[PDB]
Design a protein around this ligand. Structure first.
Ligand SMILES: Cc1ncc(COP(=O)(O)O)c(CN[C@H](C(=O)O)[C@H](C)O)c1O
Ligand SMILES: Cc1ncc(COP(=O)(O)O)c(CN[C@H](C(=O)O)[C@H](C)O)c1O
Ligand SMILES: Cc1ncc(COP(=O)(O)O)c(CN[C@H](C(=O)O)[C@H](C)O)c1O
Ligand SMILES: [Ca+2]
Ligand SMILES: [Ca+2]
Ligand SMILES: [Ca+2]
Ligand SMILES: [Ca+2]
Ligand SMILES: [Ca+2]
Ligand SMILES: [Ca+2]
Ligand SMILES: [Cl-]
Ligand SMILES: [Cl-]
Ligand SMILES: [Cl-]
Ligand SMILES: [Cl-]
Ligand SMILES: [Cl-]
Ligand SMILES: [Cl-]
Lengths: 343, 344, 343, 343
């Protein structure tokens, strides 16, 4: 099976397996796991922040950040098609008791003026806007890169209003490789950032939240409350350190494979836009096919290719370390066969 | 005094209401022993063709206990993108029920049935369960617009197929009914619960009512207790409510006629208004062609003796009600005319 | 019917009925109801606080106070048999996301030393103790008065720890009448005080919360969220002013009637302890009767007396304005006849 | 350093490090991790339940169970000194919006009659009692074994009222080893059971919840919301399988060591009760010493012995795989010296 469903399916490299087996560990609840401690120190340093927190998943990373930045009844401004709003089981309402305030965005970039208008005036009928979330390499729009200038202007707006800014940077390294903007620069215009180690970076488990000392202390207590307070998590952190320090550069290979995939799919005749492919995702439309997205995903599966439908007429293809050029070439042969059948 | 066009919530008690309240037969509602509250609820249920009803201190509580009784923690509630529950209820749905709003754009409060269908979440571990669809009749933000019965009917059909609850925020459902000629029981027939206000156009000093099935109302009553709405001798308030429900509905037509007159005349003056959009007691005025924004115009109006609310930086809302007579409207219009000269 | 079920059943006096009819009103959401404003002004003044907030019920008064004093995950120290812990539908957990930390007490008085031990130390595993609640004229213990010294000592402990103090003073005036301690004296040892107007004071609806301006502003927003933001509530406030300003002194009559009732019931042969009757409540045990509390309550109803069973062997009798000495004497004749039948 | 703070400090065995390194993995979100799937299958099998769910910690294990057994506003009956109430950061109130209803217990055993009386009657003022929690091998009381008879009785009561029963079995195997009661028998009197792999069983991370298929489905969704939905978690499950299948028998060694430790401490003169030591814990009182628990803990630390204070006058000592009889002897020599200084 050629897995193009997501970059979450990446498996540990041999270097990672050895590192986990030889991991120096301790009880993290007491802050005594050396490897977890080093991963957090490294993560904080890399993002230009004073502190960091390791978590079991990007969802918990986002949720502890929301809890640490807000109070019950607050409102959180976020992009209309963001992961926090659509794919996190409504956790923000249950855990933090906060309201989402959706703002339309163009490929992840909310117009600064719209953000300004989304901030609630001081009134008894309205919740207090205390957080603005930005997702970089906006998933739903096809792994699009949010311009640094966009984040910079929103940060200015936030500062004037005393509002916190959190970047959902699950794939922030993909954004950095594509844009040439160091992650510490994106983070310089945010109060906190969550990034995943378990997707394109290939770690088996976990993400990290970076930010100020006080913020992280609150997020650490939130993590304890949610059930993320683990013991000898250094076994996971060992692979995390390798993901952070050795798996970033090669992300360019995933981007190269995504573009190649898009160009060939277009050449075949599929409804794809190579010009929109800047990171590791390709959106394919079923508009010119005698079947919808769901029916096409089924056809692909029966032929050996796995992918997810994101709407009734759109499917998402995602490249990563475990889908080589060879697999991309094989996938294309299948796509070519299916095009003749469904065009 | 001032010409108050800010909202219909400012209506004061009629002479008949004051006497009824002061002479109300009461009891302890916690024991379900207040005779006036009981009669108000019986009358409300009957009027909407439902089995039961619950008196609450505000429309906000009416909506929130309904949301609580219809949902479980983590569920999603589909509602109109500019609805009151979403924008003006202090984020209560999140704090009180732990639910997520699922905004669906609507044309004048009417969410496209197919859009509602698409908004229902598929069963997936990543997604919360869609357990409630809320509809606001005479959608406030759009200008007191009337949601067509057929729209509500279509959404009900969709909800039923999916086992989803339907709640109508009918704060001004009687205005909708007067304008459309559709009995409120018909709108309610396509919903599981309906909340309606007695304290706005109907002129009661305090209160709203939620109507629905017996079991739902029992659950809503427990939610009311938890929220702090379980009052004692509330019969004092229910006395005015009975009069509002039974004698103040027909005259809403007068408020509509006044709002239409106001809109037509504002249009003649040259203001950015759409008389064709005015079917109930509200008029939206845009300040696009004025040399001042909404807030600046509101201040100028206040300075001239007219009260109104800005609903955006370019829009103002004018609301008619029992306490603004046709003569008051004429006076406001004469002022609106002079201000047009000053700001045009 | 002679209603001894509770003081909540009190009906409006003729004075109140007239006041409600001619009450000057306005939209309270805009802070424009003159009568509500005067009631809050008078209440704040009466308890020596900066501000006050009118609410639909004592339950909401307690809940908006908890919300205004706490943050999600905090702990609230309260008496093990208090109304907030027992009869408020678990609202503190749902509305504020806080956890109760029950402390046993002797007739409503928690041992100051136990309160100190209940304060959580700073640790990632523990919620932060941010509030201590005290109930005066403790309901479940039979309308007992909490000593001023107890409240004074707990206030000292709270201050030393930066913890807020809330007095559930639903029947604080009854406490004051019995102890001779002015309500301002009680209030001085608390950050906030909730007191009911709808019980012994005879108003038909409402309670009031008093405290500092910032606290009341937060409580007012909580009231809006909960659904307590009414419009022309001046009609209710008119009766409320009369309840607060003219119905306090006569509470002494309820206390006298309760004691008289108790002394005579004991004389008849009922299991009552007149010595325990400190305010307007009398606890009657049914152990020596041929039927239990529920069966006896039914026999009483048949004879024209209403009361509530609080357990299988206990009945609570409560006196109030609508229970005159003549009603007490008539009730006693009924109790006399029933003792002949059920002893 | 001789670590007697907790059994959570246990480090991975050689067999475990190798297993993690070669673990076959997959994306758990897709239910595709074969090692996680095998661990859950084995757990369900071992406890005689239909399904199982791996979680990052015992705290999440308890919290997803509570969320899956209850609705907002419900009440949960639990032992007055249970972990869920004291050491889980008020999570039940924030996550589930439920109220704890503490019930006194003798070393973790709540009197069945007290439990019956704690169940709320159907009344608008009361929350609905939807769950009863029992902690077998009650931590606070000193790792005490709750009698099977007690659990059976409470199960009978729960059935009568249609109430769910959850056993916090963080140390259910220690209880089984000491009582001779198979874990499957304990589980038979409960709807759900949470047990840890990260304590005495020596896994670096994780716990498991077992129960009916529908309950586990709800718990799994709760896990996703809380942020416990990991990817290639098989790395951790590999050590978990070894913990569950190979590390149970040797727990007897920890019990022998704890008993020996207690016996010798008593001979030295310390306030311990060797007769109360049946599993891997020893409670040491400081009432007969010159310093309190906190001061004695600091003295022990300076001498090479780590332990935690559980109150101002009580210290908890816990044995585990990483504490050999030799380590206990060395510790005893240290305690001996300190008795001379602080007795
Ligand atoms: C921007 C962003 N933020 C947060 C998260 C949540 O992280 P996890 O909880 O999956 O580790 C994801 C993962 N997303 C998953 C994927 O893409 O396969 C799916 C969509 O849930 C994400 O893409
Ligand atoms: C559709 C609808 N639903 C619910 C409510 C809430 O009712 P209350 O809580 O104010 O009684 C309102 C009141 N609305 C008020 C007004 O129009 O003046 C303001 C906007 O909050 C409403 O218009
Ligand atoms: C009965 C019981 N239930 C649940 C938990 C929570 O498990 P984790 O979240 O620590 O994995 C613990 C851990 N307990 C810890 C320890 O003993 O060192 C401390 C006390 O929090 C426990 O003892
Ligand atoms: Ca991975
Ligand atoms: Ca090749
Ligand atoms: Ca009104
Ligand atoms: Ca005129
Ligand atoms: Ca009363
Ligand atoms: Ca361990
Ligand atoms: Cl190690
Ligand atoms: Cl009456
Ligand atoms: Cl729920
Ligand atoms: Cl008036
Ligand atoms: Cl908060
Ligand atoms: Cl593998």
């Amino acid at each position: 099976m050629i897995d193009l469903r997501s970059d979450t399916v990446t498996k540990p490299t041999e270097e990672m397996r050895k590192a986990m087996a030889q991991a120096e560990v301790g009880d993290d609840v007491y802050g005594e796991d050396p490897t977890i401690n080093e991963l957090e120190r490294l993560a904080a340093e890399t993002f230009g922040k004073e502190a960091a927190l390791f978590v079991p998943s990007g969802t918990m990373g986002n949720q502890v950040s929301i809890m640490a930045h807000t109070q019950r009844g607050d409102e959180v401004i976020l992009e209309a098609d963001s992961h926090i709003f659509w794919y996190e089981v409504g956790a923000m309402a249950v855990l933090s008791g906060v309201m989402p305030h959706p703002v339309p965005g163009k490929n992840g970039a909310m117009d600064p003026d719209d953000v300004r208008k989304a901030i609630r005036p001081r009134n008894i009928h309205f919740p207090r806007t205390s957080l603005i979330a930005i997702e970089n390499t906006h998933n739903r729009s096809g792994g699009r890169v949010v311009p640094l200038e966009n984040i910079k202007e929103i940060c200015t707006i936030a500062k004037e209003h005393g509002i916190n800014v959190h970047i959902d940077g699950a794939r922030i390294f993909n954004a950095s490789i594509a844009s040439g903007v160091p992650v510490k620069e994106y983070a310089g215009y945010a109060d906190s950032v969550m990034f995943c180690l378990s997707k394109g970076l290939c770690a088996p488990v976990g993400s990290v939240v970076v930010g100020d000392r006080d913020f992280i202390e609150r997020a650490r207590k939130a993590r304890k409350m949610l059930g993320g307070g683990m013991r000898q998590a250094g076994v996971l952190a060992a692979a995390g350190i390798i993901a952070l320090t050795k798996m970033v550069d090669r992300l360019k290979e995933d981007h190269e494979n995504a573009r190649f995939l898009a160009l060939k799919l277009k050449e075949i005749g599929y409804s794809v836009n190579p010009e929109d492919v800047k990171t590791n995702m390709v959106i394919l439309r079923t508009d010119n096919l005698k079947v919808n997205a769901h029916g096409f995903i089924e056809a692909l599966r029966n032929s050996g290719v796995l992918a997810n439908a994101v709407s009734d007429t759109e499917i998402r293809l995602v490249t990563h370390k475990d889908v080589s050029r060879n697999d991309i070439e094989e996938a294309l042969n299948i796509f070519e066969k299916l095009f003749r059948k469904f065009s």
